[PDB]
Amino acid sequence: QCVPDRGQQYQGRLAVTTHGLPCLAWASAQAKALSKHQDFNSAVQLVENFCRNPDGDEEGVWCYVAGKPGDFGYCDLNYCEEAVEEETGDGLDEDSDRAIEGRTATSEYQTFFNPRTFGSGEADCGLRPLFEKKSLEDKTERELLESYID
Amino acid sequence: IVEGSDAEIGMSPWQVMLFRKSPQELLCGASLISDRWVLTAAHCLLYPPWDKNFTENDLLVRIGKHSRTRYERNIEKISMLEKIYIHPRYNWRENLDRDIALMKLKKPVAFSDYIHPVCLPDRETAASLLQAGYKGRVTGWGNLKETWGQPSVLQVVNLPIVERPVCKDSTRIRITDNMFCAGYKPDEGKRGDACEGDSGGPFVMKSPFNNRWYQMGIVSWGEGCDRDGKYGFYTHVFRLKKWIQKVIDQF
Ligand SMILES: *C[C@@](*)(O)[C@H](CCCNC(=N)N)NC(=O)[C@@H]1CCCN1C(=O)[C@H](N)Cc1ccccc1
Numbered sequence: 178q179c180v181p182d183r184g185q186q187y188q189g190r191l192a193v194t195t196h197g198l199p200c201l202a203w204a205s206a207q208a209k210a211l212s213k214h215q216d217f218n219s220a221v222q223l224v225e226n227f228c229r230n231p232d233g234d235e236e237g238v239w240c241y242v243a244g245k246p247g248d249f250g251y252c253d254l255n256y257c258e259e260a261v262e263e264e265t266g267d268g269l270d271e272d273s274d275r276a277i278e279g280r281t282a283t284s285e286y287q288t289f290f291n292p293r294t295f296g297s298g299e300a301d302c303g304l305r306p307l308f309e310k311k312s313l314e315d316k317t318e319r320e321l322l323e324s325y326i327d
Numbered sequence: 328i329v330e331g332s333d334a335e336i337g338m339s340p341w342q343v344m345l346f347r348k349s350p351q352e353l354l355c356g357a358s359l360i361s362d363r364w365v366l367t368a369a370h371c372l373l374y375p376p377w378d379k380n381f382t383e384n385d386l387l388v389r390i391g392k393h394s395r396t397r398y399e400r401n402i403e404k405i406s407m408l409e410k411i412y413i414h415p416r417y418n419w420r421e422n423l424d425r426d427i428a429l430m431k432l433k434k435p436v437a438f439s440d441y442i443h444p445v446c447l448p449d450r451e452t453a454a455s456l457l458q459a460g461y462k463g464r465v466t467g468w469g470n471l472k473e474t475w476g477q478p479s480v481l482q483v484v485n486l487p488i489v490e491r492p493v494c495k496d497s498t499r500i501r502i503t504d505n506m507f508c509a510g511y512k513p514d515e516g517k518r519g520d521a522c523e524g525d526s527g528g529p530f531v532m533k534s535p536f537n538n539r540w541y542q543m544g545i546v547s548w549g550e551g552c553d554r555d556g557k558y559g560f561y562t563h564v565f566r567l568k569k570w571i572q573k574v575i576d577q578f
Pocket residue numbers: 355368370371374421422423500520521522523524525526527546547548549550551552553558559560
């Protein structure tokens with residue numbers, strides 16, 4: 178009757194967006210270009226041109242409608258009441274790994290993109306030559322650090 | 328930036344100005360995340376409702392700047408663009424969900440006292456810093472008031488992160504997990520906001536654990552500037568970090 182879990186399990190036939198546009202084929206070239214750098218959940222089967230929710234969009238299922246950024250649309254499925262919400266330190270979802278690594282035993286931040294042409298910047302980023310590197314404070318950063326404490 | 332102050336020299340060395348070749352014109356801000364990649368807001372490059380669609384040859388990135396208008400030869404570096412990547416699901420038709428873009432520079436740039444990249448958050452940094460009440464800093468050369476004042480020099484303002492239910496109720500526009508909001512509440516006394524022309528610029532937080540500056544947001548959108556009961560909205564950078572890494576690694 179109603180779809181649960183933001184329609185992440187949903188196996189239906191719907192192939193038209195709320196704006197009556199026809200879903201492009203998930204297997205299509207232009208749809209694959211757009212999928213190329215995205216983070217898709219395997220338990221979500223990209224069948225044909227059917228409204229699916231691969232990325233776990235809070236808004237539910239959707240499909241591409243054409244080949245440029247932003248050319249997609251949600252599909253009007255009837256979802257369930259699902260009474261819960263995320264607050265400023267709540268919503269997770271796996272981010273900045275590959276396959277639960279763990280091994281990182283000569284550094285304790287875990288910096289990310291690999292050193293070839295990722296390019297360079299990483300080890301030192303976010304430390305200012307005229308401030309952190311000189312041991313000087315800028316005139317208003319104290320305001321920021323104090324907001325953490327009280 | 329409304330109700331901000333002039334930046335100090337080298338205070339935000341990752342700040343980038345995106346600039347139209349012809350006619351010569353500031354478009355937006357941006358941030359340097361490495362020697363050859365720049366982060367910005369997608370709507371600075373692509374917003375069909377305003378007939379806006381800039382390609383690589385239309386634009387310049389200018390790094391190390393302070394003056395809005397002066398050509399700061401020997402301090403600033405001007406780089407051409409190799410490639411633009413707009414988030415494939417940047418939702419311009421609705422609410423600017425996933426308002427983010429990456430730009431690859433023609434050649435890497437050398438760092439200096441004035442030119443230096445910002446860090447991107449890890450999950451742990453994002454979890455501890457991204458909380459209501461905590462302040463981050465926003466910079467840019469955008470309007471000084473809702474009803475324009477262009478600044479002569481880079482502006483900076485410190486603003487607190489706002490609870491999500493308060494963000495949600497402040498606007499009719501649909502807010503998502505890919506955004507957060509910041510600014511003072513009416514009856515908190517202090518004022519401040521980003522404005523048009525500031526889009527793309529970084530919302531940054533200085534970590535108490537390692538003292539590095541992390542870019543947590545990108546100036547995205549708002550309704551006016553500095554209105555009571557309204558808050559600026561920022562692209563949640565961590566929540567789109569996987570897309571950032573994938574674009575960069577697959578290059
Ligand atoms: C492109 C950016 O310079 C600018 C930033 C405004 C930030 N304002 C405040 N913090 N107060 N963004 C915009 O101008 C965006 C781009 C399209 C329209 N827009 C808006 O902010 C609109 N006023 C509201 C809006 C949001 C989402 C969709 C359509 C309109």
